[PDB]
Amino acid sequence: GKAGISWPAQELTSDPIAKFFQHGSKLSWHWNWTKHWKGPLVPETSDDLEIDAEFVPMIWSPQSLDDGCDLQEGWDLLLGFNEPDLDASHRSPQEAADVWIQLAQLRTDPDNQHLVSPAVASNVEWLKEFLSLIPEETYPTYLAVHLYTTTFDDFVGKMEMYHNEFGLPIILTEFCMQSWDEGVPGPGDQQQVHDYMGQTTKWLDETDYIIKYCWFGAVRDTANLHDVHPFNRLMDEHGEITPLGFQYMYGGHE
Template identity: 30%
Template structure:
């Protein structure tokens, strides 16, 4: 009988342990679906775009031991705000004044307060922006140099150190859902939140903000256009490099009659610098606006082989050179500064597992090209 009572007591303790013990976690429960698709990274960047369902960062499979090819310049080893590397090229060449959109309105027209962006923005040698996926991580200081001007987070959550470090923050209205719009409008009441409002994220993609040009134009007029009166410049919805993007933009500009669009936001993923150059040039010729390339990487989403390290460094060397020598490129944000690129070839990582820049990261933030 005593043995039976002991067994009952032990069983009760086990039940209590299960009932009050820590709840189990499941990384898949965060809702981050990763798909292999031609039309860019799909939900690859869900981690960085939706902070309400943020995945825990995993250590990078690429380390800072990846060595740049002989085509790159030697990068300084200190990049924090306290010891920024001096510019390797004079920042004197200003961007083109060509900024009239197909809406018939000039990007520099009157009607808003003075643009608060850094005086270095868009100048030669100061055209790097940070596509930042690490929240308030202290490693943000390791990526600020005189060459790195802007920073954005696929939303309105500005990193706590951004202002002190000298970043221009670019808030984004990611999509059309009520919670995104509410968060955007609430954040935009904050004085001096940022300098440029970024439009919707890849609305030509079903896996992203996914809306037709007419809906996007209506939402732009309601929620983005009024921000000019707060002193913001406005960047168009960011097209993926799917071929339907140019027609989508043409339809958006037509539907957004009377809107003021200062810059064209674009994304691009492929494995050829020549293709990137052609893509950007075609958009500029079509729309006639300065370009913010807010995502790009030497990444194959078409089922072919991925670039090796040497090819990626060569690609980045050519890209940085082209950006600096092209007046209508205002800034470019490589994808991405995070510990895990969530489906993109990790040889493109700009951040090592310890938070510091990889060799590719040093190359980018110091604008080191030959």
């Protein structure tokens, strides 16, 4: 399946997400905005924790390349900088393109490793300029996308814009039922979020240029929602899977 889990490294331990990949789960991957899920970057994770799923590391910002920590061994995909367009660690497209040359060196085994673009918060021009400035031999295979909207029609139009603008297959690393437009109201009730997840996951499973996707909302601490509506939660304050989490983990849609 295409469906993954995001987990904030602010939680300090990867243990709580093991239960998303238990008997019957349809979820196939996970990421955490950083290099590894067991190690100094998630330092409280139990030594013996096993997560039977693909981990996708991220180079969060230019500084992460110099942090002296290692990428999760055996990675297949590497994600570029998180929301470098936001004032995320803010860079110009040229500052990002220069650091990209150093990041792209991590692809030492190019038959079994592929690079994914930086994901912008919103600035499509930022990403167009970035991709035009990097050397062609470093061009990412996949586009990373963050899409926060509240209606299925708007979701599909924006996904189609990213596909049409950039012409790469897509890894949707962050989505849920939330608009950062302030004239756009957040979900009215919990049911609307179940409905949104059903519609979006069916469309994403049926669209061949969607390689992977990842709902935003597996967290324990409310702080780690970053003002996302708590109706988007896949996990509660105690580390237990919510009804929305159950829907997601068992395939999102019939």
